[PDB]
């Protein structure tokens, strides 16, 4: 079956973040911060589809054994099944370095980029990650980058299979522990 997601957005300044991670080790199990760093690359297929087959491929240069992973996400959904999280259509496959040269055949090209570097924590199905986004100038190299923002762009993700609804109760109840610290929202990808 085809799986779907649940995304919660936000932006928190780094000076007030130090208390928030104190909660992350105060309720979850004994995990430590990771500070993973990935390279991100936007591609698209100009097929006969009205919406171009646009996808985002990640590759972790810091960790060996993790190959190129393509993520093709769908349009925003206005359904009444989930009113507080993003409902998306996604297919997620990991393939080796034969991805990038193969993508040159159908005209997958330079759209934009954003370099992700930061922490990730989990509790069951919820995955909260706090990462810096980096923008490049002269996009040929990877060293001439800078901070795209000062405020940390914090995200929360929950993965689910096709169906398997009635999830907004548990995420909201677990976020009620952190409501005075964070105010998660379901923002549109546009405007």
């Amino acid at each position: 079956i085809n799986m779907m997601e649940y995304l919660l957005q936000g932006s928190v300044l780094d000076h007030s973040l130090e208390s928030l991670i104190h909660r992350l080790r105060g309720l979850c199990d004994n995990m430590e911060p990771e500070t993973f760093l990935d390279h991100e690359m936007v591609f698209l297929l100009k097929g006969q589809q009205a919406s171009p087959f646009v996808l985002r491929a990640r590759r972790s240069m810091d960790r060996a054994g993790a190959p190129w992973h393509l993520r093709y996400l769908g349009q925003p959904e206005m359904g009444d099944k989930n009113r507080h999280a993003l409902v998306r259509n996604c297919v997620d496959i990991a393939t080796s370095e034969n991805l990038t040269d193969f993508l040159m055949e159908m005209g997958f090209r330079m759209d934009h980029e954003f370099v992700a570097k930061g922490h990730l924590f989990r509790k069951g199905i919820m995955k909260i990650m706090v990462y810096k986004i980096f923008r490049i100038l002269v996009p040929g190299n990877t060293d001439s980058t800078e901070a795209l923002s000062l405020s940390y762009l914090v995200e929360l993700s929950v993965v689910a299979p096709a169906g398997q609804d009635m999830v907004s109760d548990d995420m909201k109840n677990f976020a009620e522990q952190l409501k005075p610290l964070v105010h998660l929202e379901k923002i549109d990808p546009k405007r």
């Binding site: 957005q9 936000g10 932006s11 928190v12 759209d111 405020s151 923002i187």
Partner: peptide, 24 residues
């Protein structure tokens, strides 16, 4: 008392990576 979160800046961040503005 301080705006650690900025909704205008957050809405600018979610739109800056959406398409090609502010890169040239």
């Amino acid at each position: 008392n301080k705006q650690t979160f900025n909704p205008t800046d957050t809405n600018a961040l979610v739109a800056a990576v959406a398409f090609g503005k502010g890169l040239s």
